[PDB]
Amino acid sequence: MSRRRVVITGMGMLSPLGLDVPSSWEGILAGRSGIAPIEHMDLSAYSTRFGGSVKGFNVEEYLSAKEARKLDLFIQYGLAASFQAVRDSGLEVTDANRERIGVSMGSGIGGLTNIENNCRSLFEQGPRRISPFFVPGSIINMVSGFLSIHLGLQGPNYALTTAQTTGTHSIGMAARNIAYGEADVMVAGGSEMAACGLGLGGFGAARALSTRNDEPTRASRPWDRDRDGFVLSDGSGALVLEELEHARARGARIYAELVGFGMSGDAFHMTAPPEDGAGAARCMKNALRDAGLDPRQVDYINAHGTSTPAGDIAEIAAVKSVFGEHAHALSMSSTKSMTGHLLGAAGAVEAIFSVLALRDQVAPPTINLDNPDEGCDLDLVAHEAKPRKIDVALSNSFGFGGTNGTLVFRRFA
Amino acid sequence: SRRRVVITGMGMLSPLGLDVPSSWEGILAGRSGIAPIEHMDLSAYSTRFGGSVKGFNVEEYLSAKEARKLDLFIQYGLAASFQAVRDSGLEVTDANRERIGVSMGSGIGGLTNIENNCRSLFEQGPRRISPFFVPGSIINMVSGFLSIHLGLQGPNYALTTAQTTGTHSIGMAARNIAYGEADVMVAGGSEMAACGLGLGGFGAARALSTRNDEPTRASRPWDRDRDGFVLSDGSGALVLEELEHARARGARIYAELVGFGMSGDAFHMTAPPEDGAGAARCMKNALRDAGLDPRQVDYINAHGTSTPAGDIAEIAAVKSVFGEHAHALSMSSTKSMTGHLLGAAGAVEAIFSVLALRDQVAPPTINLDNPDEGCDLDLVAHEAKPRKIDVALSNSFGFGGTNGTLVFRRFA
Ligand SMILES: COc1ccc(C(=O)O)cc1NC(C)=O
Numbered sequence: 102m103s104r105r106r107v108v109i110t111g112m113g114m115l116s117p118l119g120l121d122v123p124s125s126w127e128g129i130l131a132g133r134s135g136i137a138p139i140e141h142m143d144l145s146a147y148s149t150r151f152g153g154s155v156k157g158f159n160v161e162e163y164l165s166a167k168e169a170r171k172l173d174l175f176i177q178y179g180l181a182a183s184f185q186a187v188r189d190s191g192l193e194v195t196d197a198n199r200e201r202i203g204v205s206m207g208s209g210i211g212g213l214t215n216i217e218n219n220c221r222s223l224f225e226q227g228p229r230r231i232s233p234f235f236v237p238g239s240i241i242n243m244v245s246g247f248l249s250i251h252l253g254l255q256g257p258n259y260a261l262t263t264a265q266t267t268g269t270h271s272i273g274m275a276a277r278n279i280a281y282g283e284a285d286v287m288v289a290g291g292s293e294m295a296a297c298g299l300g301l302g303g304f305g306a307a308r309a310l311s312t313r314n315d316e317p318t319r320a321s322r323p324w325d326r327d328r329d330g331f332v333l334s335d336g337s338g339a340l341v342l343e344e345l346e347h348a349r350a351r352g353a354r355i356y357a358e359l360v361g362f363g364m365s366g367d368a369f370h371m372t373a374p375p376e377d378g379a380g381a382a383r384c385m386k387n388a389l390r391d392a393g394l395d396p397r398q399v400d401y402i403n404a405h406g407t408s409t410p411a412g413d414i415a416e417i418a419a420v421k422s423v424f425g426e427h428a429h430a431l432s433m434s435s436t437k438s439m440t441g442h443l444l445g446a447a448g449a450v451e452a453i454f455s456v457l458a459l460r461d462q463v464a465p466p467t468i469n470l471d472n473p474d475e476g477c478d479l480d481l482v483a484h485e486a487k488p489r490k491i492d493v494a495l496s497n498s499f500g501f502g503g504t505n506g507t508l509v510f511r512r513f514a
Numbered sequence: 515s516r517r518r519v520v521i522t523g524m525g526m527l528s529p530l531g532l533d534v535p536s537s538w539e540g541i542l543a544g545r546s547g548i549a550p551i552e553h554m555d556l557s558a559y560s561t562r563f564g565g566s567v568k569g570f571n572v573e574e575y576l577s578a579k580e581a582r583k584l585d586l587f588i589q590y591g592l593a594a595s596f597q598a599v600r601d602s603g604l605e606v607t608d609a610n611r612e613r614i615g616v617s618m619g620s621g622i623g624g625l626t627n628i629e630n631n632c633r634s635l636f637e638q639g640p641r642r643i644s645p646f647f648v649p650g651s652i653i654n655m656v657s658g659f660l661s662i663h664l665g666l667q668g669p670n671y672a673l674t675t676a677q678t679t680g681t682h683s684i685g686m687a688a689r690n691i692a693y694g695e696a697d698v699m700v701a702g703g704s705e706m707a708a709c710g711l712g713l714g715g716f717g718a719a720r721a722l723s724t725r726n727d728e729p730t731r732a733s734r735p736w737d738r739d740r741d742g743f744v745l746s747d748g749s750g751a752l753v754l755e756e757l758e759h760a761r762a763r764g765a766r767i768y769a770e771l772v773g774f775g776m777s778g779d780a781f782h783m784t785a786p787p788e789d790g791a792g793a794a795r796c797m798k799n800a801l802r803d804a805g806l807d808p809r810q811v812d813y814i815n816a817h818g819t820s821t822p823a824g825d826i827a828e829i830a831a832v833k834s835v836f837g838e839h840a841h842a843l844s845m846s847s848t849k850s851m852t853g854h855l856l857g858a859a860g861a862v863e864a865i866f867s868v869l870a871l872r873d874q875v876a877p878p879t880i881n882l883d884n885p886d887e888g889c890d891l892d893l894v895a896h897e898a899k900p901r902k903i904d905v906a907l908s909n910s911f912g913f914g915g916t917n918g919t920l921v922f923r924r925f926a
C-alpha cells in the first residue's frame with residue numbers, strides 16, 4: 102500500500118518535572134528544574150551526586166505491587182507512560198483491531214539497577230540467589246512485551262536501543278510501520294532508569310557528567326560557556342501514533358501530524374560528534390526532505406542540547422548549515438536545561454514537548470543560558486518561554502556510535 | 515510498488531566455526547558445538563555447558579587497544595559484520611556511503627562487561643569502573659563502531675527483541691531497502707551471555723537444560739527427553755542489497771529476501787500459547803508479505819529451542835499454517851547443534867536458511883531420538899537431507915511473545 106499519513110492521538114510521560122504530561126509541561130513552561138541531590142543511594146564516593154529523579158512515582162497507580170516487584174524501574178516507567186498514552190488516545194482495543202496495534206518502546210541500557218542488584222546477589226551470596234525474573238524483568242524489549250500482554254496488542258512488537266537516540270528512533274520507525282501499512286496504531290517512545298552505581302559511576306568514569314554538586318539546578322546549561330557535561334535523568338515518554346484515516350474514522354483528538362523522520366550516522370567517533378555537526382546536518386536534511394518542506398518552514402527546534410562542550414556547539418553548527426539565514430528566525434531550545442538527560446527516553450519526552458509546543462504555540466526555554474558561548478548567537482529562548490507562531494517543530498537526538506535521529510511534527514487542522 | 519532485496523554477503527561466529535563455511539560444514543555433518551564452559555567456575559550453577567566461540571582472535575579485526583574498549587558481544591558482532599561486507603565485495607564510496615546502513619542487534623547485550631565492572635565497583639568502588647563501560651557495553655555499538663570503521667552514513671540503529679533480535683534486525687533492514695531508505699544494510703545480531711548473570715539468570719528461570727553429563731545431547735528439539743535450551747554465543751551478519759544495485763556491480767547473490775512477518779502473542783512473558791497462535795499469525799504475515807501460498811514453502815528453520823512447551827507450540831503453528839503441506843516440507847532446528855544464540859539465533863539461522871537454498875539440503879535436527887507426541891512432521895532427524903528447496907522460512911520467538919519470520923527464495 103501507498104505511504105499513509107501518521108498523527109499523534111495520545112501521549113504519556115514520567116519526568117523529573119512530573120508524573121504525567123500536563124504536570125511536566127507546566128514545569129517546562131515555568132522554567133522549573135527537576136534536578137536535585139539523589140536520595141535513593143549513598144553517592145559520597147561519586148564525583149556526581151545529583152540528577153533528575155522521578156519524584157513520588159507510585160507504580161500501584163498502574164500495576165499490582167506483586168507484578169511490579171518483578172520489573173526493573175525502566176519497565177515500570179515505560180508501562181506507566183504507555184498506559185497514560187493509550188488512555189489519552191481513547192483507543193478501544195478489540196478483536197477487530199488488536200492485530201493492527203503494536204508497540205516500540207525502547208531504552209538506551211534497560212534494567213541496569215536490576216542487573217546491579219542481581220550482580221550483588223551473585224557475588225556476595227551466589228547464583229542460587231539470582232531472581233527467577235532477572236531476564237524478563239531486565240531486558241529492553243519487555244516494555245513492548247508487558248504492554249502487549251496487558252493490553253492484548255498483537256501488532257509489531259519490538260524495541261530499539263540506539264543509546265541517547267532511542268526515543269526519537271523508536272517514534273520514527275513506529276511511524277514508518279504505520280506509513281507502510283504494517284500497523285494502523287503504534288505505542289512508541291522510550292524509558293530509562295540508569296541512576297544506580299554503574300550508571301553514575303560509568304558516565305562519571307567517562308567524565309561525561311556535570312560535577313556541579315554545589316548547584317544541581319544550574320548544572321544543565323546547554324550552550325552556556327561554563328557547561329561541564331550532561332545531567333543524568335530518569336523517566337519515560339510514550340506516544341500513540343495512528344494512521345490519519347484510522348484516527349479520523351473514530352473521531353480521535355489529533356495533537357499534531359508526524360510528517361518527517363531522518364536518520365544518519367556520523368561515522369566519526371564512539372562518543373563525540375564532529376565539530377561541524379555534519380551527521381546532525383545530514384539527519385535534519387533527510388527529515389526535512391522526508392516531510393516535503395522548505396527549511397524556512399521550521400519555527401521551533403527542540404535541540405538534543407545535552408550541556409556538553411563538544412555536543413552543544415556541533416548542534417549550532419548543524420542548524421547553521423541546514424537553515425542558513427533562517428537559523429536566525431527559528432527558535433531553538435534545550436528542555437534538558439530543566440529535565441536533564443533522560444538518555445533513551447530523552448527523544449520520547451522531547452517529542453512530546455515538541456507536540457505541545459505546536460498545541461500551545463510556545464517555545465520552551467533553555468534555562469541557565471547566562472553566557473551563550475562563542476558562535477551560540479541563535480534565538481536559544483534563554484531563561485523564559487517564548488509565545489510564538491510554530492507550524493513545524495523539529496526534535497533532534499544524537500547518540501553514542503554517532504547515531505542521529507530527527508522528527509518533524511506539524512500542526513494538524 | 516517496493517524494491518527487491520537480495521543477500522550478497524554473510525558472516526558468522528558460532529560454536530561450530532569462526533566463519534560461515536566452517537559453521538555450515540559442521541551443520542551438514544551433524545556436529546555439536548556444545549561443551550562444558552571453560553572460561554569461569556560454574557560449580558554453584560545447575561548448568562555448566564553451552565556453545566562457546568572457540569579460538570576467536572579479535573586482532574584479525576581490531577587493534578588490541580580498540581578491542582579492550584568493547585564487550586565480547588560487540589567484538590562478535592563486528593567480526594560477523596566485517597566478514598559479511600568482505601564476502602559481499604561492496605565498495606563504500608563518497609557516492610554511496612549515505613545509502614549504506616547497519617542494523618546489528620543483541621538480546622541481552624553487555625552482561626559480561628557489566629559483571630566485570632560490577633566486580634570492580636563492589637570490591638574497590640566506582641573509581642575502578644572503566645571509562646569505556648557505557649560506550650563499550652551498549653547494544654548499538656556494533657552498528658556504531660561498524661559505521662565509524664567503514665564510513666557508513668545510512669540508517670544506523672539496533673534492535674533488541676530478546677531471542678527474536680536477529681530475525682527482526684534482518685527484516686526491518688530489508689524494509690529500509692524495499693522502501694528506498696537505503697540501498698545496502700548490514701543486519702543481524704550478536705550475543706555473549708555466558709557470564710554468571712546469563713547462566714544464573716536463565717537457570718533461575720529453570721529455562722536451561724541441566725544435562726551436564728552429556729552436553730552434546732542436551733539440545734534435543736521435539737525429543738520426548740528435552741529439558742530446556744542450551745545457551746550459546748556468537749554472531750551472524752548479512753549484507754542485504756537492493757536487487758538493481760547488486761546486479762549493477764556484478765554482486766554474487768545467495769538468495770532473495772521476499773517476506774518478513776512480525777506478530778505479538780500478547781500471551782505471557784516467557785511461554786508461548788500452546789497452539790502457537792502468534793507463531794501462526796507471524797508465518798502467515800510473512801507468506802502474505804512475500805505473495806506466496808503456504809504450499810510454496812519447502813524448508814523451515816524452526817526456532818526449535820528444546821523447551822517442552824515451545825517446541826510443541828511451533829509444531830501446532832506449522833500444522834495450522836500449512837495444513838496438508840505440513841507433511842511435505844522439511845523442518846529442522848539447527849539449535850540441536852549450535853544451541854540457542856539468543857539475539858544472534860535469528861541471524862545465524864537466516865544464514866543457514868540461505869545456505870539450505872544454495873546447497874539444496876535440509877540441515878538435520880540432531881538428538882531427535884524419540885519424537886514427542888504430535889511431533890510427526892519431517893523434522894530431518896539425525897542427518898542432513900538433500901531435497902528441492904525453492905523457498906525457506908526462518909522463525910524466531912522471544913520473551914514478551916515477540917515473533918519474527920523471514921522468507922527467502924532461490925534467486926534466478
Ligand atoms: C556522538 O556524541 C554524543 C552523542 C550523544 C551524547 C549524549 O549525551 O546524548 C553525547 C555525545 N558526545 C558529546 C561529547 O556530547
Ligand SMILES: COc1ccc(C(=O)O)cc1NC(C)=O
Binds near residue numbers: 819822912914
Ligand atoms: C514466548 O516464549 C518463549 C520465547 C522464546 C524462547 C526462547 O528460548 O527463545 C522460549 C520461550 N518459552 C518457552 C517455554 O519455550
